[PDB]
């Protein structure tokens, strides 16, 4: 017969993971990886946090069974997740307006939400920032939802174009979904101020949007509580919203796939009715989530001694990135860059829009073995005191 | 504005997992759970295998990072999976005709296959046995694939209705997917003989079906190699096929979500092209799979010492279930059953298709605290020397 796989077309390279494959195969010893968002320590390693090793040790000696978790995962994991997102004494929690499912990573939480909406509501369009995480469009298209873009970044002044953002979103109709980065906007690193959040929250309720918050970097901007102010302004004003969160990065648990999808509705009867369909969409996907990574997170967040250790480790990560931002800017000037890169100090999180062209990013990789994303996004957390000088010499050589 | 979640219809109760929730709530003492397919030991517990504990200690001591796995997971995990399925010296492997993706459980493997087929092929129809695992239809429907049923079980002789199976698949077109259970058919426990497998393999190639094997219980019928005879009869004749396999049960790693989706095509260049689109379907779902569970399996299968331990543990599990099958039939007679349950001994795996009616199943639960699936499926692996007598007295009471 003809053959079913014979005419399949090869898939294009992932703009992020394809770069990581090239880096791994590169044989040059001085190669530098500033692509995929991984936290490196001063020594260039990607370590397991001490709080995580201690929690895994507890699990190894106390686990007696591997029997399936519920569709929505470990209950304590869900409860602790809502506390982090909304606060200890939140009204959503007391009113029982929120339900949380443990998911395989933030990516898994985005697909679950996308499947949930495409199959149980009349949602048709998702509004995503321009630029944004490249995988956002793929997740929502694969679920059958259209993806529209709204303006965000002023490339001239390296700032948030709040006028163009609101003008773009005026085309978003009621019932549409609008995606917001909770903090540390990927890839620009520019987040709204609290006042700008409150403006979007009020505009969101009067326009009829369904907010969808992507929360992959809580604690990397200013702090655990501070980074959730934007979400908590929306939460104090909307009847419905969705939060897809990730523990991959603030716990360094990338490959264990630890995330959550939290559903908020007007009242407890509606959220439970909606959550039953979300569990059905999970059942038809991976059935139940992996336990190891979420058990680690739950063990840490529920033990005051481990949590204290983890909160300090997260502070050290946040502050090392800030030190590298300063060192990055100073070193560029020291190596002969005549452009002003001071805007990089004002950006939060792991990434920064360097302003380099696709052709310059290509030169960096081929000629100097410095790997950045074609959009000019660089992982500041991949910079160390040892690789800063060769890295900045290469950037100056291509300007 | 009117809420987006108001017109959502509540999802029905899951036929398997909704049962486990009723069991956890039942306050009556002596309740017995013969529902969800978990392996219990002689004492009524769901333990962690010794080999799994050994492997987990090795990972705790030697893991230095939680860096993301590739989209397709741990390479060694895929190689050992192919050896398990096809044999150490298979032509499929030497010709490099197979590619394997690590997935979250067999469920995740099935969903990945469904998404891959729906988006990259002209497949529109999947044929599933009647009866089958209830979640099969949900997974393929989630991708928009039509699911048709073919006849399988002779509920009169308690055997494979091979004549009806052949006739009911007459309308299966070339390019349709036909789903086969590799061994330990769920729920009936009746598998095709080697001669019947070979007959199906010949018919499958003549009609141009795309075979999809669900392999969740390798090693629970007769043995690791013996249980794969049917798959290898198909593999020797077909240019293309798909295998969703699970390690949830033969390793007791249920909640770590350890599975694999294997893709087989005519040649190495074709499978590579097709596999790139499978990875794209994974990227738009959970991005990359969880490491812990698959790392355990790869460690055991690669270490000669641990593998010998695991194989003996799998033999112990298989043999206890077979003794419980014999004891179940003997005790039913002892307790006054006039219906002949000898067919139980001929069935393979954890599950016994008892032939009880939905009314009798509901009566066992509400009246005696014995929990089985409404189809009459009972988990033999949940029977113990301590609960056998009350269980059989309950059944006899409703016959
Ligand atoms: C904005 C954003 N959303 C989602 C994700 C996915 O996170 P995870 O690795 O937990 O799937 C990432 C990074 O991976 C991200 O930067
Ligand atoms: C036939 C069959 N396929 C797939 C599965 C799913 O297994 P997993 O837990 O790996 O998702 C099961 C049981 O759970 C099964 O019986």
Author numbering:
A (entry chain B), B (entry chain A): -2 to 396
Give the article text:
E. coli aspartate aminotransferase (AAT) is a pyridoxal phosphate (PLP)-dependent enzyme that catalyses the reversible transamination of l-aspartate with α-ketoglutarate, yielding oxaloacetate and l-glutamate. Using our approach, we enrich the less populated but catalytically active closed conformation in order to increase catalytic efficiency (kcat/KM) with the non-native substrate l-phenylalanine, leading to altered substrate selectivity. Steady-state kinetics reveal kcat/KM increases of up to 100-fold towards this aromatic amino acid, resulting in a selectivity switch of up to 1900-fold, and structural analyses by room-temperature X-ray crystallography and multitemperature nuclear magnetic resonance (NMR) spectroscopy confirm that the conformational landscape is remodeled to favor the target state.
Overlay of AAT structures (Chain A) in the presence and absence of maleate show transition from open to closed states upon inhibitor binding for WT, VFCS, and AIFS, but not for HEX, VFIT, and VFIY, which already adopt the closed conformation in the absence of bound inhibitor. Superposition of bound and unbound structures for each variant confirmed that closed library mutants VFIT and VFIY remained in the closed conformation in the inhibitor-free form, similar to HEX, while OpenLow variant VFCS and OpenHigh variant AIFS adopted the open conformation, similar to WT. By contrast, the HEX spectrum at 278 K showed a large broad peak centered at around ‒61.6 ppm, with another peak of substantially lower intensity also appearing at a similar shift to that observed in the WT spectrum (‒60.4 ppm). We calculated ΔG at 278 K for HEX to be –1.72 kcal mol–1, a small difference that would be compatible with the interconversion between these two states to be part of the catalytic cycle.
